DNA sequence: GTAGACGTGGACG
DNA sequence: CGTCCAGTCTAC
């Protein structure tokens, strides 16, 4: 999941678990049933702990916890979702981690491919440096300076898929959709964009992230769609208002765009076994 | 730059 | 059966 899904997920985890007391976390299968996550033993030795919040930056999610009788000593759960990571209020297929709160309340993290990660830490300093490895959150920051794009002689699709250079939160489908709406060829070097292209790109980045955030059935978050429609949405990018009510794929994994224009499934970014497919429509997206 | 890896599928032929 | 597609790390 990308920025929008991770953020909505954290909103839901906060609604249900902020102020609750975590009593145990069990890794019942997957990678962490075979090997302990970093810091697990030390964290477990300090349970139970009260959840003070759940927050996100880009695709990175974390819990903040503390003991009411020593409110200064804070604990953190670091979480990345990878490709198939998903939280839920019920024990779904591929459940890897089970969080047990007071009064039989439960949270479950599921992950088919096991690419998601957990780390436990007692260091606010370590988290701060971690957050500093990520660019500003595309969804939650309303004034990122997108003109930094022009300094890089690299394909705009790679610059946007990077989590540090311009901003964090965008992934394979957001980028493709954004570049289609902005009418920009994915190959175009950031250093070749005009100031108008940049302004237009920033408009559409906000438009798409907000649209995805606001959606109730994006796909991945099936395990929370009951909760998604029962919770509100924070007023990110307040001045931008998508017309559609659900996020729709215009080019991603499509053979044609909505107007019948051919969609190319291009392999621009990556090498070896990390190559990604960039969907774009040449008829619409050009170098101008 | 290039290459590989991390489990587990779904869709399709 | 088979093939291809589906966030981020690491090394030469």
Curated annotation (Swiss-Prot):
GO terms for biological process: base-excision repair. It catalyses: Hydrolysis of DNA containing ring-opened 7-methylguanine residues, releasing 2,6-diamino-4-hydroxy-5-(N-methyl)formamidopyrimidine; 2'-deoxyribonucleotide-(2'-deoxyribose 5'-phosphate)-2'-deoxyribonucleotide-DNA = a 3'-end 2'-deoxyribonucleotide-(2,3-dehydro-2,3-deoxyribose 5'-phosphate)-DNA + a 5'-end 5'-phospho-2'-deoxyribonucleoside-DNA + H(+). The active site is at residues 1-2, 57, 276. The keyword Lipid metabolism does not apply. The keyword Hydrolase applies. Pfam families: Fapy_DNA_glyco, Fapy_DNA_glyco_C, H2TH. PANTHER family: FORMAMIDOPYRIMIDINE-DNA GLYCOSYLASE. This is Probable formamidopyrimidine-DNA glycosylase. It comes from Acanthamoeba polyphaga mimivirus.
